[PDB]
Symmetry: C2
């Protein structure tokens, strides 16, 4: 009875504390119509320029427009509990999950003292590495999209959820055929 | 041309910065005789008692006996470069990889400004989730060990490397049969 949740974050740099989680996007992997997204105020002035070029965001604007980090993580928790029943379990799902998890875990423990996702994350590249036993270099998103033919942090969350479903079907078929 | 590296860390709590990475163990997944291990001085006074009960370590002793964190990450880097050729690529491998990666990434960027593993980690639970398409709850180490029948941060690194090899063989066989 598991509810898989596709999560993606935008950040101003490679690690939390020194750098900031700037936005969260999340959808229910198998019910992507159920969606969560918000922007955060930075917790640091430091940033990597290449990282800010990727996001397109402004730290100065987010200091005015973003949510206080505690409010963001409270709302994320509320959402998670809204899509997961007491008799159900949540599973964090990400693409290069360890990056996004490092920020989600840091912020949950800093601001709320607990991470409702628990302690483990499901990583789609790692899943595909096992389904297809291709090289690690060939788990890049573009190389996956050639094999599985799929059709902003929320946009990334929805796209990654679709990869998850297709790799899921590929492993189910491989297992049951 | 990829060199997989099984890594495990011991920590005083759930997230870096607020809590400390206390020890590193690492072996070459497919050449486990090549091994790296060290203890670190804490970077924080905070700790979760349950976490310290698991490790058996003493923060007060590690402040005297451990390596300065910069020296630990320099030595880890040297080791990584010692087992990986210029024409080769390293792949971080962990069990619940996102936990260990969050500490390894934090410390590499804090102390050295770069992570030689890159930006992604291979997670064994996620790999097995795809090879076997079992439930996530059934990716726990004990449940994996029932199916694949395998035979301290270094001890964990070597054990997890053996799970990796067996799941690897299971996906190769599943793919080629």
């Amino acid at each position: 009875k598991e509810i898989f949740v596709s999560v993606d974050v935008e950040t101003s740099g490679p690690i939390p504390g020194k750098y900031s989680m700037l936005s969260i996007g999340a959808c229910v992997a198998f019910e992507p119509s159920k969606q969560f997204s918000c922007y955060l105020k930075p917790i640091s002035e430091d940033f990597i320029p290449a990282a800010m070029e990727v996001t397109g965001l402004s730290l100065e604007k987010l200091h005015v427009d973003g949510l206080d980090p505690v409010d963001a993580m409270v709302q994320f928790k509320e959402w998670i509990n809204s899509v997961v029943k007491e008799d159900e379990t949540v599973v964090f799902v990400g693409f290069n999950a360890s990056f996004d998890w490092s920020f989600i875990n840091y912020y949950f423990h800093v601001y709320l003292g607990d991470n409702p996702f628990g302690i483990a994350a499901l990583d789609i590249k790692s899943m595909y590495f096992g389904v297809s036993h291709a090289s690690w270099r060939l788990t890049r998103s573009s190389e996956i999209a050639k094999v599985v033919k799929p059709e902003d942090a929320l946009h990334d969350a929805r796209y990654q959820a679709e990869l998850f479903r297709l790799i899921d079907k590929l492993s189910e078929k491989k297992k049951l055929d």
